[PDB]
Structure formats: structure tokens, C-alpha cells
């Protein structure tokens, strides 16, 4: 139960502006306050929410500046009517000062004078911040309600909380005594922070943080109150500071229209012995300030794609004349323990604090069988499992310089390694990356372009011969590498390390020996995957010459080969794949999407479209052929039916491909054309239809096709070892 014990569980959200701090007081439920940042020298002795109104303290830190050592300042509200004010390394004693003030005034509450405090902050590395609040702290009042208190405070340990995960838990828990739960959000969702100086808008799909789109904004409440100010002073033809003029004039009337939803706000200053109904010119402020924010978060509800969005701060509670409409519209949740909206951030953290707080055959039994069709765009590989099948992933071929430390079909989706071997080059010889999707979602990222290059193409390739080593439960594994069309595979023989730094193996080390070697260079074998397959033991497909054509339809390009006697020929490619196909689908659905309300793209990537829209109505096609496919599209709070869309541009790509694909075999005369690649599940509408008149034939397992030329050096690669 009670970890105190002396210690004081805090969130604490410092920004530019305030200091926001959520602590469990003696109670067990959650106390609030706030101290504006702003620090006053101050002479050595003197000269509810009753703390914070006069904070005259002398700080003794070694978590400062010596000179600031140990020397008195005014802190907070109070140093705000000081004229040798400080407001926002440089100097870092205005943020250090106001913050440690706020641990004191709270131990003071629960009454204790020696606290200890592990920090739960955030940042608006990160070791590298929690070494500049550690060791032991002594705040001695020199007035105020704790007139000659001295607290004492101990910073253990600590976490920064900018982890993400820790920034929607205001929402979905709460502290009364014990823990309570307010899930009812998406798996993605945008969150809010409507702060005085800034506008915070983060995004999260899945579990995190998604910084390719998350912004910060200039869109704070103070230009607006600054206006409303300056008119209310034209029209008495003062509140000295905004957070006066907050807490006085219009928080009253804002939790009257909380209390009631039916109330009618009534705005009225009295000056020196003057009473003037201002009543309009803040409502409009107000409403002014309401309505930027609906264009602005509507904007970034767009760009995300976000299924939930989530507004909080005190921006809600300063515009909620017009922002209480956001109540109505769905996609849209207010956390409504409304009146805590300003402290939703520090409440987080809070509660993240307190959580940590809580603490014939084969026989192959360390060999690795696979056949690797390493690419431009993805690096697609077949390998032999335990059980004797086949297994097939793909990595994309894009990489990022990652930190050396940590700060189905889906183990692959979060690949944080590091690659040891004799065949890279620069510094990349010893040093993390990240592989896959995760250099996509990352600004770091190098991309293949149109050679070095060359550890863009290494690095995929190793990570996959690493999933697949780590997927059978061997820490490592020697293979016999089957590659595709003198080499430099030996930067590939010799040996490999690749170890996990973060994933689902984490801190497994996976070291790769290379022996052997062939290429599948005469085209024979590129084909094998059509007569053969693996299941468990090794069996010819179902239904099945002198020579065939072959037809890879892949993401950029269409190639054409031509093999007789087995043996490869008049083999072509054409810049006749799927990528501008898709593009202009895209293009066209974005565009039906363009009218009545509608910032970028419903889709992140080309992936993204094909995984989440496509490839699922693929499979019920596949599985029936009697299945009408639905394309839908949602757009933020838009839904569509883009059905014509996705098909027209399917079925145009098929009669394209068909247009190709008989010339070729004119020319050839191949007694047999086999359609392999991913282009075939793509264009799959017309190409199962126009497979039955061309007489060409696609293979089966069909939702296997994008594979099949890795599958084919696979058994190349088994037959191989098979002598
Ligand atoms: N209950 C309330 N009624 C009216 N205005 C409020 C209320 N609570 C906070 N505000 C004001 O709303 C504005 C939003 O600022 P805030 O969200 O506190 O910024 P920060 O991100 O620094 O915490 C502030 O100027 C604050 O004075
Ligand atoms: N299961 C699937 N359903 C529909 N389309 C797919 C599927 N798998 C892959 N694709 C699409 O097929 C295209 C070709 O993929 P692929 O042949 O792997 O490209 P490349 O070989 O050029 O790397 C890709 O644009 C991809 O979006
Ligand atoms: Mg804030
Ligand atoms: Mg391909």
C-alpha cells in the first residue's frame, strides 16, 4: 500500500510559462497547483492555494548555480511584481528555482519537511536530464504560510515520461484512496495540450508517439487575453498580469457555464471605483481564440487520420464558450473532470510516477535454409521453420542511424539492432541502425536512389537472416545463402553479428556464419517455386515444358524473362509496376475527398494503403470468387465508399499488364507464361478473370506470389544441400 515511508509521488509538467504539479497528498486522491516561472532576488531575510500566492524562499542545490547556491529569490505570483524579474543551459536557474519551490510547498502540505521525491517530468538524451535534478535539495520559506519551514528534498530517481505511453493516462485512470479506471479510444488517437504560450498537438498510432506529424504551435491563449486587455482599456474611455485577469474575471463565470450548461456568462471589471459590463469583449475574445483552435485541430484530425482526439489544458477552460461544442461531435473527447483539464499533463505523470513506483529428410537443429530475393524496396526472404514449412516476411529496404543504447508477420515491427560484421564499412562497422518501416517513421532515414549505398542493401538483409534465426530459437545458425540475379557475396561468407537492441528478441545476440554460396544465375531455378513446394518434406505442386516466359510484376518495375531448355535467354523490364497505378488511385480518392469540408493524405505510404485497404479484400476474394470486394475510406470524420476508384485503377493495371504480357510472349513464344510477384495480388480483380482467356498461368498458393522468387532460391537452396 503506502510507500511513505517519506515519499512524495509528484507529476510535474514545466513549461515556459507555469509549473504544473499533480501530487498524492496525506489523502490518497490528487492535489494541484501551479507557479508561473518566474524567480526575483531577493534580501536574506524577510522584508485555498494560499501557497503560491507569496513564495519568498532561499534554495540550498547542489543542483545549482553555486551563485544561486545558496542565496534568496521571490518565486512565482509574487515575483511577477518584481522588476528585476527573470522570465524565459541559459540560465536553467529559472526553471531549477520554481520547480524545487513547488516539491517544498507540497511536502509542506502532507506536512513533512524531508521528502523523497522520485521526478516524474516530461520533456517539452533523457539520463541526461534526471542528472540535473538528482542529489539532495533544502528550500527554506523566509515567509509565506510556511514562515520559517525548512523542507528538505531528496531526487532518487526518476522518468521522464516523454515515452508517450505516459501522456493519455489522465484519461483512461484516476487516484481516489486507490486506483481507478475513468479503452472507449482507437489504437490511434491525437492529443491536445492547449497551453498560454504554445499549442501542443501529438499523435499516437498504435501504442506511440508518431513524430513525423506530432507539432508544436504558437497558438496560445496569451495573444488572445492580450487583446481582450488592451480593448477592455478602450473602451474605459488594471489587471496587472494575465494569470490576474484569469482567476479573478473569468474563471468564476467559466465553471458557472461547467456547472450549467444553460448559463449566460456575465463579464464585469470595476476599475479603481468604475464598473464597465465587458461582458462581449472577452466573450469574443473568447470565441475568437474557440474558433482558430476548431480550425487547427480539425487540420491536424486530417493529417493524422486519428480515430480519437483528445483536447485538454487550460486552453478548454478559457474557450469553452465555444469549445464546449467539441462535446457534440464524435472523434472528439474532452476528459471531463473538466475543471482538471489544465493539469491533464501533469496528472499523467502523476500516475505514471506512481505506477513504475509499484514496479531421407533434412534434419536441421542449427542450420538455416533460406532463400533471400534482396531488393531495391523490400528485402523479401523464404526460410525453412521448426515445423519444416516455409515462412516469408519482407523488410523495407530503408535504414536509420539509431542510438547504441535503448531510451503474425510482426516481430519485424520493431527491429533495433546492431550490425558486427567484416562486410560493413565507414563507422557502420560498429554501430546501431534502425531497419525496416522504423527508418520510414524516422528523419534520419536513408532511402535507395535513383555503390555506398551498399550498407542499405547489407544491413535488411542480415536483420532478416537475424528474424529468421531468432524465429526458429537458435542463437545462431550457419546458412547456405541463395541469392538471385566473381561477387562481393563475400562480404557475405566469412561472419556476422546482429545484435537486438529493442523488439521482441530483446538483448538476443544473433551471429551469422556464411559458407557457402550459389546465385540461381540460369534462371532454372528462378522458377522452381511454381513446380515445387516444401511441406515438411518436399513435394511437387498440384498441377503443374521446352521453355516459359516469366513475368515479375513488382513495385516499380514489370521484368520479362525467357527461359528454354530451363536454361535463361530477350529478357526485359518495363517501368510498368504498380507504384504509379497506386499513386494515381490515391490521387483520385484524396480528390473525391476534396469537397463539403475537407491537410495532406487519408494514407501515410503506399504500404499503408495496400495492408489496411487492399490486401484484406484481396484475401476474401482469393478464398471466393463469387465475393464482391468493398473498398471504404475513412478520412478523419469523412467515410466514402472509394470502390470504383481502388477497382478502375486494379483493372486498367491488369488490361496493362495483359497488354504487356502477350507481346512478350509473341516475341518469345514461350509454351508457358508464369505471373509471379505482388503485382499479381494488387491487380488480382482482372488478372484472376483475364488468367482464363491469355492462358497464362498463376501460381498457388497464390497469396504467396509476392514471394515466389525468394521461394524458388529456397528450394534451390534445399535441393542444394541435398546433394
Ligand atoms: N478554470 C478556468 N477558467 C478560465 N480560464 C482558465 C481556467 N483554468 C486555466 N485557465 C486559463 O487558460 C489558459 C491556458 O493556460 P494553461 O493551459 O495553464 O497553459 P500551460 O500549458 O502553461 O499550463 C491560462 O491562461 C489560464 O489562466
Ligand atoms: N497481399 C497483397 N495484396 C495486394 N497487393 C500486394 C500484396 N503483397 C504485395 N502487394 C503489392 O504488390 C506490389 C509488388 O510487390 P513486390 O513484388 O514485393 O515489389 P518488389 O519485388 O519490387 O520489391 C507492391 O506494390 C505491393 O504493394
Ligand atoms: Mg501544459
Ligand atoms: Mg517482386
Same mark, same amino acid.
Given at each position: ?13 514545466? *513549461? ?61 505570483? !509574487? ?11 541559459? #540560465?536553467?536557474?529559472?526553471? %531549477? ?14 506536512? /513533512? ?8 517530468? @516530461? ?9 540535473? %535534478? ?105 489587471? /496587472?498580469?494575465?494569470?490576474? +485577469? ?20 456575465? +463579464? ?45 489544458? @487550460? ?6 464558450? *465555444? ?7 464524435? *472523434?472528439?473527447?474532452?476528459?471531463? #473532470? ?10 499523467? !505523470? ?8 509499484? #514496479? ?26 521448426? /515445423? ?47 531497419? &525496416? ?17 551498399? /550498407? ?26 541463395? &541469392? ?8 557475405? !561468407? ?41 511441406? #515438411? ?10 521453355? !516459359? ?175
Amino acid at each position: 500500500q503506502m510507500l511513505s515511508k517519506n515519499m512524495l509521488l509528484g507529476g510535474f509538467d514545466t *513549461g515556459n510559462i507555469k509549473a504544473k504539479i499533480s501530487f498524492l497528498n496525506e489523502k490518497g486522491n490528487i492535489e494541484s497547483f501551479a507557479i508561473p516561472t518566474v524567480i526575483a532576488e531577493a534580501p536574506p531575510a524577510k522584508i485555498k492555494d494560499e501557497d503560491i500566492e507569496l513564495l519568498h524562499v532561499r534554495i540550498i542545490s547542489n543542483s545549482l548555480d553555486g551563485d544561486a547556491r545558496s542565496r534568496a529569490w521571490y518565486v512565482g505570483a !509574487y515575483a511577477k511584481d518584481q522588476e528585476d524579474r527573470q522570465e524565459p543551459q541559459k #540560465n536553467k536557474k529559472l526553471h %531549477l528555482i520554481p520547480l524545487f519551490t513547488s516539491m517544498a510547498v507540497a511536502a509542506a502540505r502532507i506536512g /513533512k519537511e524531508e521528502v523523497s521525491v522520485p521526478f516524474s517530468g @516530461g520533456m517539452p538524451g533523457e539520463e541526461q536530464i534526471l542528472e540535473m %535534478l538528482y542529489g539532495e535539495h533544502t528550500v527554506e520559506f523566509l515567509d509565506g504560510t510556511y514562515e520559517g519551514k525548512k523542507i528538505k528534498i531528496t531526487i532518487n530517481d526518476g522518468t521522464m515520461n516523454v515515452e508517450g505511453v505516459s501522456s493519455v493516462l489522465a484519461i483512461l485512470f484516476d487516484i481516489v484512496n486507490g486506483e481507478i479506471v475513468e479503452a472507449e479510444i482507437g489504437e490511434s488517437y491525437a492529443i491536445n495540450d492547449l497551453g498560454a504560450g504554445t499549442s501542443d498537438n501529438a499523435f499516437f498510432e498504435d501504442g506511440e508517439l508518431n513524430k513525423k506529424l506530432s507539432t508544436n504551435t504558437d497558438l496560445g491563449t496569451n495573444k488572445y487575453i492580450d487583446e481582450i486587455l488592451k480593448n477592455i482599456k478602450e473602451r474605459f474611455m488594471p489587471f /496587472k498580469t494575465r494569470e490576474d +485577469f484569469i482567476q479573478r474575471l473569468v474563471m468564476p463565470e467559466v465553471e458557472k457555464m461547467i456547472e450549467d450548461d444553460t448559463y449566460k456568462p456575465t +463579464f464585469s471589471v470595476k476599475w479603481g471605483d468604475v464598473k464597465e459590463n465587458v461582458t462581449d469583449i472577452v466573450m469574443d475574445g473568447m470565441l475568437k481564440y474557440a474558433e482558430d483552435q476548431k480550425a487547427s485541430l480539425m487540420k491536424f484530425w486530417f493529417k493524422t487520420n486519428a480515430d480519437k482526439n483528445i483536447v485538454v489544458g @487550460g486552453g478548454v477552460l478559457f474557450g469553452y464558450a *465555444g469549445l464546449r461544442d467539441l462535446k457534440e461531435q464524435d *472523434g472528439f473527447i474532452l476528459p471531463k #473532470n473538466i475543471q482538471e483539464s489544465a493539469y491533464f499533463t501533469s496528472r499523467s !505523470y502523476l500516475i505514471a510516477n506512481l505506477l513504475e513506483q509499484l #514496479n531421407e529428410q533434412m534434419l536441421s537443429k542449427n542450420m538455416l535454409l533460406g532463400g533471400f530475393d534482396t531488393g531495391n524496396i523490400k528485402a523479401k526472404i523464404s526460410f525453412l521453420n521448426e /515445423k519444416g514449412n516455409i515462412e516469408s516476411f519482407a523488410i523495407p529496404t530503408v535504414i536509420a542511424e539509431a542510438p547504441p543504447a535503448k531510451i503474425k508477420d510482426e516481430d519485424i515491427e520493431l527491429l533495433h539492432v546492431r550490425i558486427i560484421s567484416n562486410s560493413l564499412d565507414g563507422d557502420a562497422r560498429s554501430r546501431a541502425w534502425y531497419v &525496416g518501416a522504423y527508418a520510414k517513421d524516422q528523419e534520419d532515414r536513408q532511402e535507395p536512389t535513383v555503390q555506398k549505398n551498399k /550498407k542499405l542493401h547489407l544491413i535488411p538483409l542480415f536483420t532478416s537472416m537475424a528474424v529468421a534465426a531468432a524465429r526458429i530459437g537458435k542463437e545462431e545458425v550457419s546458412v547456405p545463402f541463395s &541469392g538471385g540475379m566473381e561477387q562481393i557475396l563475400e562480404m557475405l !561468407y566469412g561472419e556476422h553479428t546482429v545484435e537486438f537492441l529493442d523488439g521482441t528478441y530483446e538483448g538476443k545476440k544473433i551471429k551469422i556464419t556464411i559458407n557457402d554460396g550459389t546465385m540461381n544465375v540460369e534462371g532454372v531455378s528462378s522458377v522452381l517455386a511454381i513446380l515445387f513446394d516444401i511441406v #515438411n518434406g518436399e513435394i511437387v505442386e498440384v498441377e503443374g515444358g521446352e521453355s !516459359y516466359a516469366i513475368n515479375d510484376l513488382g513495385a516499380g518495375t514489370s521484368d520479362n524473362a525467357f527461359f528454354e531448355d530451363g536454361e535463361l535467354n530477350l529478357s526485359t523490364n518495363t517501368d510498368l509496376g504498380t507504384n504509379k497505378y497506386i499513386d494515381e488511385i490515391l490521387k483520385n480518392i484524396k480528390e473525391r475527398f476534396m469537397e463539403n469540408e475537407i491537410i495532406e493524405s487519408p494514407f501515410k505510404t503506399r504500404e499503408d494503403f495496400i495492408q489496411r485497404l487492399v490486401m484484406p479484400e484481396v484475401e476474401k476474394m482469393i478464398e471466393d470468387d463469387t465475393y464482391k470486394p468493398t473498398f471504404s475510406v475513412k478520412w478523419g470524420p469523412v467515410k466514402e465508399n472509394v470502390t470504383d476508384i481502388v477497382m478502375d485503377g486494379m483493372l486498367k493495371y491488369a488490361e496493362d499488364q495483359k497488354a504487356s504480357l502477350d507481346k512478350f510472349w509473341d516475341k518469345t513464344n514461350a509454351d508457358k507464361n508464369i505471373v509471379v510477384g505482388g503485382g499479381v495480388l494488387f491487380g488480382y480483380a482482372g488478372l484472376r478473370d483475364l488468367k482464363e482467356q491469355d492462358g497464362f498461368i498463376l501460381p498457388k498458393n497464390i497469396q504467396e506470389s509476392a514471394y515466389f522468387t525468394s521461394r524458388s532460391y529456397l528450394i534451390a537452396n534445399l535441393l542444394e544441400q541435398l546433394n
